Amino acid sequence: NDISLIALLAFSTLLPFIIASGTCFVKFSIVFVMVRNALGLQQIPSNMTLNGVALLLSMFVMWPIMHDAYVYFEDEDVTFNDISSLSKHVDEGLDGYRDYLIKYSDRELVQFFENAQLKRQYGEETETVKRDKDEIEKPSIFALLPAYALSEIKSAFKIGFYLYLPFVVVDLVVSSVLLALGMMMMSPVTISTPIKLVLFVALDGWTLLSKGLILQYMDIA
Amino acid sequence: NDISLIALLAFSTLLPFIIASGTCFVKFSIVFVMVRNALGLQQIPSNMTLNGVALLLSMFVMWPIMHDAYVYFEDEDVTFNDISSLSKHVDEGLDGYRDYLIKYSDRELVQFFENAKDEIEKPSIFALLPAYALSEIKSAFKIGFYLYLPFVVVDLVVSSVLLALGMMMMSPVTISTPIKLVLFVALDGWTLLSKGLILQYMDI
Amino acid sequence: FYALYFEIHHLVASAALGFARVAPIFFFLPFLNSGVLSGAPRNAIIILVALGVWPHALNEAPPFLSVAMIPLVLQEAAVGVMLGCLL
Amino acid sequence: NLQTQVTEALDKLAAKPSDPALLAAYQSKLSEYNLYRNAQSNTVKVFKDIDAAIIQNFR
Amino acid sequence: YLDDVSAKFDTGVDNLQTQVTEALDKLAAKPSDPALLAAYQSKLSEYNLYRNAQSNTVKVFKDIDAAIIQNFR
Amino acid sequence: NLQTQVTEALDKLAAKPSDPALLAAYQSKLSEYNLYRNAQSNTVKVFKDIDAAIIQNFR
Amino acid sequence: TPWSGYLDDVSAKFDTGVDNLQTQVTEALDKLAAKPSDPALLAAYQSKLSEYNLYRNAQSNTVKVFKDIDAAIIQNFR
Amino acid sequence: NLQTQVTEALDKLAAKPSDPALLAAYQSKLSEYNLYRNAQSNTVKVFKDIDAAIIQNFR
Amino acid sequence: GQAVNIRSMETDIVSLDDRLLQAFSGSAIATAVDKQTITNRIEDPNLVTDPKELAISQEMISDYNLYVSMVSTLTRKGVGAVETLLRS
Amino acid sequence: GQAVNIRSMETDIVSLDDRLLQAFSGSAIATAVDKQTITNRIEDPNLVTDPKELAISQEMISDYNLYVSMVSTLTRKGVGAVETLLRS
Amino acid sequence: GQAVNIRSMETDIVSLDDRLLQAFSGSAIATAVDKQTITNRIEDPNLVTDPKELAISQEMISDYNLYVSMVSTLTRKGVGAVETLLRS
Amino acid sequence: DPKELAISQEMISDYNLYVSMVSTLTRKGVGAVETLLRS
Amino acid sequence: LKEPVIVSKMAARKKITGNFEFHDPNALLEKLSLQLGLIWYFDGQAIYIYDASEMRNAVVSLRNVSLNEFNNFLKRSGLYNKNYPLRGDNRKGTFYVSGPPVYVDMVVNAATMMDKQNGRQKIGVMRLNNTFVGDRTYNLRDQKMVIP
Amino acid sequence: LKEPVIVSKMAARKKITGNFEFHDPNALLEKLSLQLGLIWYFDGQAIYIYDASEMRNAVVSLRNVSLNEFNNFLKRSGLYNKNYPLRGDNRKGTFYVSGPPV
Amino acid sequence: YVDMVVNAATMMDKQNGRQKIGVMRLNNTFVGDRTYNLRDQKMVIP
Description:
Helix content of chain C is 55%, strand content 0%. Chain C is built from 3 helices and no strands. Chain C is globular and about 45 Å long. By secondary structure, chain C is mainly alpha-helical. By secondary structure, chain I is mainly alpha-helical. Chain I contains 2 helices and no strands. The longest helix of chain I is centred in the C-terminal third of the chain and has 36 residues. Chain I is flat, with a radius of gyration of 18 Å. In chain M, the strands form 3 sheets. A 3-stranded mixed beta sheet of chain M has the order 1-3-2. A two-stranded antiparallel ribbon of chain M has the order 4-5. A two-stranded antiparallel ribbon of chain M has the order 6-7. The chains are: A mainly alpha, C mainly alpha, D mainly alpha, I mainly alpha, M alpha+beta. Chains A and B meet through helix 4, helix 10 and helix 11 of A and helix 1, helix 2, helix 6 and helix 7 of B. Strand 1 of chain K pairs antiparallel with strand 4 of chain M, so a sheet runs across the interface. Chain B: It is a multi-pass membrane protein. Chain B: Belongs to the FliP/MopC/SpaP family.
């Protein structure tokens, strides 16, 4: 009973590094540095404030997931009488976090790590598991979070490639009209920069990309 | 009273991020850098001495909201037998922040966040804090495009008069940059954009 | 109950050499560099990737013990930039 | 107002320090004032140390 | 370890815990005999020496490992 | 090997926990054994505390 | 070797300042318990048992004042 | 040289632990050496501790 | 005399701060009624003399001690966890 | 015979600089008198020998500790909020 | 008496978490049943009047202090060891 | 236990300083490579 | 089989394919646990199945009951297994048990739960025949002699 | 079946399809719990359903109460299930139980 | 339904035999101890 409190404080210290890895905060953070890089501004818009706006939407989506942890662990019947049911109880506590990882991660990239960990575990003579395990068997929690965070880097880079396109089509036509004249010894990035800012505010990319990401995890009404 | 000592501390450690994200400090700190990038400067004046003056300008318009919260929370009627009347009471202090935020945020975006009029009930504080910041960054970008434009003209006209002569292999940054800042000090553009920025939120 | 502390303590010893092999691939790749990745969750990702690929068992004792430690990091970094420059 | 009925029983024993009923009653008073004062001393003490721990936590 | 420093007092005397009980069983039978009263004070007073020298040596050893564990960190 | 000649005096008091000469010599042992154990634990501790400060400095 | 300390110095300092009290109380218990009525023997051991009580507390309470000071040094170790 | 005249007065009390005049002078001696030794321990300790604080600041 | 309420109030609010406001006010009221309750148990001079009541008095000062110290350390880790992402 | 004053005057601030001068000067007088209150409580030796006055002096010390510690950390966290913003 | 299983063969685990979780569940039920059986040892009045039983219960109090503090700082050093690696 | 905990007092701590040492060396190790690749 | 089957986690990674038929599965379970390599146990309600590399061993001491007292409890309840019998001396406290992990941890847990739950005088009457009884005193007026 | 049914979420990932006819449901449950692999229990108010891999067991000791008195309490209450009985000696304190977790 | 019935039965135990006098007239013997001063030994019959 008392060392259950030790497990809470030990859980408390490694929390924001789970937020560094386990949640979808890694998806919001990457595309916002990319829109800083795609516009060509280096220091501005001062990414210390950009950490705060990317965190508040991710907690806003993660909140129904983390809220169920309180109602599961403030139950008055935590203390059981058997050693396996209490370890079963913490498993069924962690399943609401766990199936969220199942839904949004890649199939084969998680599947590669169990086969990679078993040959590390016993040796090569253990036979490999194929795709067909997915209907009945669940993987471990430490073979998930590697393959989750790499997969979200793939999806965030899918987004980061796409809005890089409507700015670099601009960045070639400015560099050609400058060479349509004899203006070769001129820095074209200082002419492309006005029309780079209008194409995000006339398109109003802030107030529609922010709405686009929340539909990729949750729905409305 | 003892629990309120936590919340007084809980404001203070989170203070340099809410002022980083929930006030007009973001607009002052953004326009003061692209004016350097308009003139073709990198390290002049700094990133330090520009953040200092941006802090004090935001300290004008934010303090009266902050000032009423002392005298409202210093009052003697903090002993209440009810849970919810104190929950109403701390909600009644933050409405000064709410009327500041609703004035400069978009009503359509906060209804989207509300799903996941405003006279009967105010919307939640977490439902509009990105919407204020996401509207300011667009407007600072929008006002950032405007003052970029006259400096485009001095970069183009001197590049055309060197090509008007035969000298095409000549870097015009050593000539435009003298002509760049005299356009900003004969206009005295520093002392006037700081005026209307105060007038953009607080009337004269 | 002393060996249970040693199992988490053998892991954190095992991750240091695992970090030295695969960190300069996280500098080279175009979708993984410091231009695309922040500072706070960078060092979280690079540690746990090497934990999923380490060939030896984690609870066992590592064969690292006082053989030659300062030249071993420059070995594993030099083969690391090879995997970076081929990939 | 406990110190009042502390300070009212010594005087009848001061005028007569040989009555058997009063010093027994006097002892029943004075040990309880002994018990009351350090109780007040011990109770302010918990309120200082746990309040000093909060600024110790946030510093 | 702390059981063995306790059990060294339970091993070093044979049946003293029973020797006091059979003595006072005889004392409650006829509490008026001079050879029975004199033997009991030699036997009752040895027991109180035994248990406080059981509990105080483990007490000084209790805080000593408690001094050991706090110097881990 | 100090703990050996500590552990050799407990048994004679175990057979006779009423000898006045033995417990006098035993107290001179056990308090001296008290001075040995915590001194060695605290002195290795400074040798522990200062090497971590260097790596805390150089990191 | 049978080793001696500074606390073993002061305890055996008591044992060399006295000479035969660990045994002088033994010859008078042989003597007085032989005939347990002699007035030159009853007062003989009462001068022997009494000095046995001062000397054993003096060798004991010296130890406690000489322990805790060495505790106070090691308390000043960190 | 205080420890010298400490170590010279215990032996006459060792030879005579019943002299009423000697142990009275001995207690006034021995408690006085007790107050001196921990005072020296506590006074060097602050001079170490404040000396440790400067390197704590500049590290 | 005792009393208990059994069904905890629960619904779905997509609003976030008011659930935290109920947690703050629900903690603020429960720590304010008990600071009086420990004080008037101690200032009532009849309860402090009875040994039956003293066993409760050691309990309630410990229940107040462990509770607010627990909230102090969870929040400190809470405000320290957010510090590590924005400081960069 | 003791005395209290009942008028808390108000002078208008012309700026924020005029505001901060009252909060410092109103507190610097208060932090000087209470430390001088507890010494004259001590320096009168007839005050420190009575049991009833000791809990009064016990209360006035602990309020003095809690007062100046509460103004120190806020100014520390206040200037700490300045250092992070200027670093950005 | 007591029981010993002889073969502590390294049961190879798919990850290290189930080993830690079984160690956490192997000891949480341990210290919980100890906390009743010494309190009920105290709470039973017939257990505490015997001097023979009292030093046995004196012993388990010193064990219960030593057990959990030997597990506390071991994980406290463990969290402190792992964060210095993960911070970087 | 007084001799076993004391020899175990060093045995936990030295393997903890060694694990902290091997992780800081990897940081200056790859950090020297990072700055040299930017050159 | 009229009972639910419980297959372990490590024994489910092996595969088997082919045409099977069931008409006496208690003889089929014994044969397939030796050709493939497995251990199984039936406790009256279910069938637990482990692979062969999960067999664990134990040795326990009983302070006040015998093995022959405990074996009648095992036979009467219905958990007695003739493939994994108890190896030990017939009247002692120590033995050696080994088998599947659900079979071993039950017998040990019940053995340490019977000792914690757990001489007769008698009167003989002898009438003497050659001597009086009780102590006598002889007042022979020279000295008070007593014969006990 | 006149009671509500609570199927757990570890036995809710398996799927089913097909034309079913309900004319003898308590025997339909007996065949389908064995063909798919499941364990069930009916306490008089509801039917709980677990998978076969969740059956746990324990041994508990009664200090001063016989098994035959506790077995007469189970017959009078309504919790006696002859499918998962109580294994043990008729006059002792120790017995063996196994079954569904509820 | 379950959380009300559990708490309302525990709180009733914290809320929660009669002696009696019988008079029996004897019929074949006196009551109380008697003494017989038979001057050989002070005999008492309880």
